[PDB]
Amino acid sequence: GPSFPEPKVVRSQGGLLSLKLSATPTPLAIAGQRATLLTYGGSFPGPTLRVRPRDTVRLTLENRLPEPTNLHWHGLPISPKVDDPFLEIPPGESWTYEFTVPKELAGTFWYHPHLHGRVAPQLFAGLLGALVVESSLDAIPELREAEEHLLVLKDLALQGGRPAPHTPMDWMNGKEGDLVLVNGALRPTLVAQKATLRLRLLNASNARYYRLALQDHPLYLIAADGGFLEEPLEVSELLLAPGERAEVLVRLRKEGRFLLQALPYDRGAMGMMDMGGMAHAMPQGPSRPETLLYLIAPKNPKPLPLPKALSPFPTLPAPVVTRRLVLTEDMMAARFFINGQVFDHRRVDLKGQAQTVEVWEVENQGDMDHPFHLHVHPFQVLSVGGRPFPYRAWKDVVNLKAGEVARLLVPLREKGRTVFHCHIVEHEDRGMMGVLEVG
Ligand SMILES: [Cu+2]
Ligand SMILES: [Cu+2]
Numbered sequence: 001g002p003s004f005p006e007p008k009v010v011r012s013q014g015g016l017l018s019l020k021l022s023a024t025p026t027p028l029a030i031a032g033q034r035a036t037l038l039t040y041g042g043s044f045p046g047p048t049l050r051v052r053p054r055d056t057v058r059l060t061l062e063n064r065l066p067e068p069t070n071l072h073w074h075g076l077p078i079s080p081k082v083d084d085p086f087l088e089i090p091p092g093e094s095w096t097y098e099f100t101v102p103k104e105l106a107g108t109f110w111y112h113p114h115l116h117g118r119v120a121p122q123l124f125a126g127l128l129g130a131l132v133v134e135s136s137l138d139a140i141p142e143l144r145e146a147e148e149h150l151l152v153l154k155d156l157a158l159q160g161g162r163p164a165p166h167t168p169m170d171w172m173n174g175k176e177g178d179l180v181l182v183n184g185a186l187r188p189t190l191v192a193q194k195a196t197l198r199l200r201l202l203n204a205s206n207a208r209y210y211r212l213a214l215q216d217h218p219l220y221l222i223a224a225d226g227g228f229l230e231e232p233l234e235v236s237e238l239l240l241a242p243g244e245r246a247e248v249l250v251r252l253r254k255e256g257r258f259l260l261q262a263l264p265y266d267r268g269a270m271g272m273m274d275m276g277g278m279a280h281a282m283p284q285g286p287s288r289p290e291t292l293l294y295l296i297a298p299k300n301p302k303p304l305p306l307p308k309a310l311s312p313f314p315t316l317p318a319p320v321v322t323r324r325l326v327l328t329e330d331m332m333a334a335r336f337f338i339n340g341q342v343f344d345h346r347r348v349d350l351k352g353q354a355q356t357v358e359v360w361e362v363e364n365q366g367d368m369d370h371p372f373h374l375h376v377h378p379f380q381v382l383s384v385g386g387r388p389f390p391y392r393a394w395k396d397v398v399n400l401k402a403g404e405v406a407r408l409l410v411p412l413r414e415k416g417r418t419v420f421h422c423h424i425v426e427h428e429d430r431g432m433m434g435v436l437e438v439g
Helices: 119-124 168-173 425-429
Strands: 009-011 016-029 034-040 048-051 056-063 072-074 094-100 107-112 129-133 147-156 179-182 189-191 196-203 210-214 219-224 227-235 238-240 245-251 257-262 290-296 322-330 335-338 350-352 357-364 370-374 380-384 397-400 405-411 416-422 433-438
Touching: 009 016, 016 048, 107 196, 107 219, 107 245, 119 425, 129 147, 168 425, 179 290, 238 245, 357 397, 380 397, 397 405, 416 425
Parallel strands: 009 048, 016 056, 048 129, 147 196, 189 290, 322 357, 350 433
Antiparallel strands: 016 034, 056 094, 072 107, 107 129, 147 179, 196 245, 210 238, 210 257, 219 227, 219 245, 257 290, 322 335, 357 405, 370 397, 370 416, 380 405, 416 433
């Protein structure tokens, strides 16, 4: 093991993972001063949980914060009476989450808070961690002998030894920070010992986007948010919006040292300037480039061949209803809407039936990018902007630029009441969420 850090791992044993985890304030040392964050298990990021299909999970959460909280199990297809967005745990009390892992699941998932009105300050302060589901496909020679790592992407900012407070502009644009970190560290070094790598990737930031590229190399895509592709797909760069995940293979062919970067991207945020003229002044424009890590290749590298096939994607029944959902903005007031209204936890917006399939059309009539998320029921993307999607795999977040319409196929699984919302989490707290009931 070189000198590259990753979070501590907890694994199942005899078919069961049973753990007591506390949410607490903690002092750390990360930039140049004393810093007290809010953490799970005393670390930033929290610990990684690792399981297999048909295992039982029993997680007891102990609240030692000065305000109430709960958990969302992002991407898991389980009952909404377990993954419950309306529950509240008071200061000083505990609650146990119990479920079984579904039979055909594989990939990278995560856990974080979801108490409406307080999501954005609690996630910015440090509360998140990863969950990994192993597969029988991981045994084939082209994956078994690769060098494997997890990369958690998240940014931060400090004031007076605490996380910086939210400002009026933050509720409008969403909050970014100046310290851009990997696995809790500023620009770490990875000294590789093999020529083929398998990297699992997670965007756990409040609002920042990452346009990823490795100097002098392409990337080979093998999984999306919620499962494997049908075969590997070669790309030259890869955009990841807040809440999305992916897995890739890298093939090193020459000695050297190579930068992994987040390249310039314009997500439509609005700026602060005063009367000084240019030729493009009012929006913020594209981001500045950032260096994520340094990657050093081994001596005389010889990479492995690619796998020929992965997992076939299932066929689904024909649909019986169509929905249309339109997103809009009021920027100076920082208020955000779905079909002309804001969230109300006592109102039901859609009613569907278990064991049927629906077509959902989601349209962006604003000027900013917005990334759309649905709880409990994963989906297949068919097209964006009237043009075809490039692969077949399970997803749970889809990005939309200004003007774009996405078409989705949605099979309805577990019964009960759940939600859908934007994952720029400041926009969720300020109105952009609604309610679905399945009977
Ligand atoms: Cu989430
Ligand atoms: Cu939004």
